[PDB]
């Protein structure tokens, strides 16, 4: 049930993160309320168990699998990790970073804290943030702004279950600051802006 124990895609993140994120990228970015809390608890329970049985052999299909079940499965994967993808050990460091006065100093300090993560946590987190960055860029269609996403994901990502104001801020700022925090070059920036333009026009 540990992050490093998962079956890994060729990008070296867990198959389950890759498959759920890729499914939503293909079929969910225009849907209003994507990632909002709804659906059948039982169905994301069964889907998470199928990913745990053998992640490579799970094929998410637009007929069998509902978007909201896949989004709930992705959140539940992060909630049930033995160690939150943001490390439990590092939570005091995250909060100290969130309390710094200027935005740009907070972003540099987030990169410091991210460098304290094992590589697989860094890569998993980078994929998630980059995905939510695209979600919020498509908000004219799906109505999901950065703040909405941060509120929905912070409990699962940090495993604080809503208690702490800081975790919401960090996520909001990781997502808005995705390009700088994760060192995305301007070629990739342009490819993302074009892909979003295709999605929202």
Distance separating the N- and C-terminal Cα atoms of the chain: 41
CA nearest to 130, candidates 191, 79, 72, 87? 191
Phi, psi of 165 (to 5 degrees): -60, -35
**Which tokens go with 108?**
């540099």
Farthest-apart Cα atoms in the chain, separation: 48
* DSSP assigned state of 38: -
| Upper half-sphere CA count for residue 191 (Cβ side, 13 Å) | 6
Phi, psi of 8 (to 5 degrees): -105, 135
Name the 3-class secondary structure at 3.
helix
For the four alpha carbons of 15, 117, 92 and 134, in that order, the dihedral sign comes to negative
Task: Report resolution (Å) to 1 decimal.
Answer: 2.3
What residues are paired with 8 via a beta bridge? 14
**Which tokens go with 184?**
């995305």
**Which tokens go with 157?**
């990502």
Show Cβ contacts of residue 8 under 8 Å, excluding neighbours closer than 6 positions: 14, 15, 120
Question: Taking a C-beta distance cutoff of 8 angstroms, is the pair 39, 72 a contact?
Answer: yes
CA 141 – CA 54 distance, rounded (Å): 34
Q: Which CATH architecture has domain 1-201?
A: Orthogonal Bundle (1.10)
| Upper half-sphere CA count for residue 53 (Cβ side, 13 Å) | 9
For the four alpha carbons of 167, 170, 6 and 72, in that order, the dihedral sign comes to positive
Give strand ranges (E) for 75-193.
Answer: none
CA nearest to 189, candidates 153, 137, 144, 143? 137
């Amino acid at each position: 049930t540990g992050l490093q124990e998962q079956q890994m895609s060729r990008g070296d993140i867990p198959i389950i993160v890759d498959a759920c994120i890729s499914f939503v990228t293909q079929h969910g970015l225009r849907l209003e309320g994507v990632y909002r809390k709804g659906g059948a608890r039982a169905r994301s329970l069964r889907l998470l168990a199928e990913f745990r049985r053998d992640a490579r052999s799970v094929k998410l299909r637009p007929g069998e699998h509902f978007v909201e079940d896949v989004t709930d499965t992705l959140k539940r994967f992060f909630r049930e990790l033995d160690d939150p993808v943001t490390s439990a050990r590092l939570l005091p460091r995250w909060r100290e970073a969130a309390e710094l006065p200027q935005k740009n100093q907070r972003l540099e300090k987030y990169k410091d804290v991210i460098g304290c993560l094992p590589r697989v946590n860094r890569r998993t987190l980078a994929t998630l943030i980059g995905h939510l960055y695209r979600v919020q860029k498509c908000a004219a269609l799906n109505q999901m702004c950065t703040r909405n996403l941060a509120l929905l994901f912070a409990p699962s990502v940090f495993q604080t279950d809503g208690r702490g104001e800081h975790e919401v801020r960090v996520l909001q700022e990781l997502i808005d600051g995705y390009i700088s925090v994760f060192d995305i070059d301007s070629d990739q920036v342009a490819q993302i802006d074009l892909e979003v333009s295709l999605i929202t026009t």
